[PDB]
Amino acid sequence: QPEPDMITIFIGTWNMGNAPPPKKITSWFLSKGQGKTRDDSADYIPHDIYVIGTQEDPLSEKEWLEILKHSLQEITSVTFKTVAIHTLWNIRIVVLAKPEHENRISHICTDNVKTGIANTLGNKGAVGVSFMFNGTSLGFVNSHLTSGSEKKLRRNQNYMNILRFLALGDKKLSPFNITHRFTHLFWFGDLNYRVDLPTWEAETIIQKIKQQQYADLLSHDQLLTERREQKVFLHFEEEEITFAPTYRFERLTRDKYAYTKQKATGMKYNLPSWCDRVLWKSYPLVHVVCQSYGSTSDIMTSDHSPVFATFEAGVTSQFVSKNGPGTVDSQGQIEFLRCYATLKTKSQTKFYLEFHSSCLESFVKSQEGENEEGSEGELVVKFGETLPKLKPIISDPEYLLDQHILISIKSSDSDESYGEGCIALRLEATETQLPIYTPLTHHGELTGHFQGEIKLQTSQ
Numbered sequence: 001q002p003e004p005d006m007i008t009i010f011i012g013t014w015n016m017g018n019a020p021p022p023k024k025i026t027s028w029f030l031s032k033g034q035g036k037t038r039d040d041s042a043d044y045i046p047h048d049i050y051v052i053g054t055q056e057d058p059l060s061e062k063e064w065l066e067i068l069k070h071s072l073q074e075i076t077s078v079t080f081k082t083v084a085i086h087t088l089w090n091i092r093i094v095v096l097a098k099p100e101h102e103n104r105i106s107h108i109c110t111d112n113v114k115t116g117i118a119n120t121l122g123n124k125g126a127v128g129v130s131f132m133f134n135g136t137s138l139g140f141v142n143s144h145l146t147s148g149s150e151k152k153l154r155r156n157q158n159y160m161n162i163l164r165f166l167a168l169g170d171k172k173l174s175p176f177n178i179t180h181r182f183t184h185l186f187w188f189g190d191l192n193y194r195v196d197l198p199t200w201e202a203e204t205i206i207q208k209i210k211q212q213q214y215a216d217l218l219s220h221d222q223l224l225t226e227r228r229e230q231k232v233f234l235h236f237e238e239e240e241i242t243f244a245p246t247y248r249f250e251r252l253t254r255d256k257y258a259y260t261k262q263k264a265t266g267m268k269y270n271l272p273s274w275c276d277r278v279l280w281k282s283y284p285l286v287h288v289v290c291q292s293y294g295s296t297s298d299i300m301t302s303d304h305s306p307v308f309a310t311f312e313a314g315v316t317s318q319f320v321s322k323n324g325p326g327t328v329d330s331q332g333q334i335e336f337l338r339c340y341a342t343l344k345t346k347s348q349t350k351f352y353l354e355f356h357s358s359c360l361e362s363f364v365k366s367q368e369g370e371n372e373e374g375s376e377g378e379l380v381v382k383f384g385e386t387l388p389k390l391k392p393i394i395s396d397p398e399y400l401l402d403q404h405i406l407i408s409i410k411s412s413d414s415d416e417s418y419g420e421g422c423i424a425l426r427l428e429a430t431e432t433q434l435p436i437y438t439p440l441t442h443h444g445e446l447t448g449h450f451q452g453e454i455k456l457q458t459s460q
């Protein structure tokens with residue numbers, strides 16, 4: 001039985017509005033309703049992995065697991081295995097996988113982050129799951145961010161706290177936050193970003209939604225605008241939105257948006273908004289294709305509609321050679337030429353690099369670089385031809401060209417990372433000097449750039 005080189009992943013996010021679901025929710029898992037929907041001809045084909053995020057979930061873990069598993073069994077005739085379930089307050093993530101994947105999945109991690117302080121600590125935050133699927137690391141974050149049209153900055157702060165403090169994936173990757181630890185990272189939830197138009201325009205907005213004319217609404221979506229200004233979700237992708245706003249509906253119909261201020265809303269307007277979202281970030285030159293992104297039309301227990309997204313995601317096998325794992329393979333090497341880091345920092349310490357990759361027996365520290373002044377005020381750290389030669393565990397190009405090197409640039413004085421990035425080994429050529437490039441981030445904010453050349457030797 002061959003190991004897969006592709007799997008399909010279902011991502012669901014639903015704010016349940018503290019109400020039990022209806023008896024049938026299969027349309028959610030089938031990607032049926034509005035937006036980019038799944039072909040009918042696929043309905044019996046199970047996804048490999050289903051990741052379900054809920055917010056304002058009133059059910060016990062047991063109650064929801066019974067509904068989920070029984071739903072997927074009705075659709076696919078497959079009894080899914082529970083990979084992980086984690087709940088913080090009313091925020092929950094469930095990971096289910098086809099039974100054939102049970103012995104491909106390992107290193108399962110769960111964590112949560114509570115956002116805010118005092119007043120603002122008590123119901124918002126995130127839950128997450130990570131695991132290895134054969135040679136591929138997968139991370140999943142379900143977040144319920146701060147509500148309210150005038151709190152986009154709070155939401156951006158909630159995002160930064162979640163990506164700093166959520167402890168998933170390989171702890172040996174100590175300089176790297178979740179935005180660098182996974183081949184594929186999926187971040188979804190009730191992110192609570194709103195359509196930022198005047199309150200007086202409520203009925204106009206509703207009109208536009210009834211005509212399926214979303215362009216003038218999406219141009220005011222706070223998540224799109226904040227992402228465009230690099231305030232949040234830097235280097236993440238989102239599929240084009242082609243479904244109606246998923247909040248705020250009158251319960252038990254989808255015919256009505258309930259936007260007017262009420263005691264129950266703290267006297268806040270809830271203009272129709274795309275609160276409920278799915279974004280991803282994959283390592284460079286890994287296959288990832290969004291095959292659905294939409295909302296259901298027939299699940300009306302909540303003031304939110306469920307959102308679905310599905311993905312084709314490239315995976316690799318758990319590779320064994322005569323040599324590595326357990327030793328190096330001297331027919332392989334990774335060389336770096338003419339490399340330099342450009343940093344935004346106003347500080348003056350020496351810097352060194354750390355290289356981390358599962359293709360190495362352990363991480364590698366460089367010598368310190370040479371600081372120079374850039375012509376526009378910047379710090380340029382020159383490594384020239386001084387970087388160590390990296391010794392991969394396996395030299396076979398079928399393995400090595402699928403790997404990635406994580407780079408941290410660290411202060412000699414503090415050993416704190418000033419920037420993190422990733423380089424793909426999926427090169428156009430081996431034994432050839434080729435340009436490489438990654439942006440550098442720290443706490444998910446842009447802090448600089450790393451560029452230079454690479455020379456990769458494989459056994460072929």
Ligand SMILES: C[C@@H](Oc1ccc(C#N)cc1)C(N)=O
Nearest residue numbers: 081082083097101102105108
């Ligand atoms: C840590 C956990 O391992 C698992 C659980 C579920 C799957 C699946 N599918 C694979 C591995 C355990 N000890 O049960």
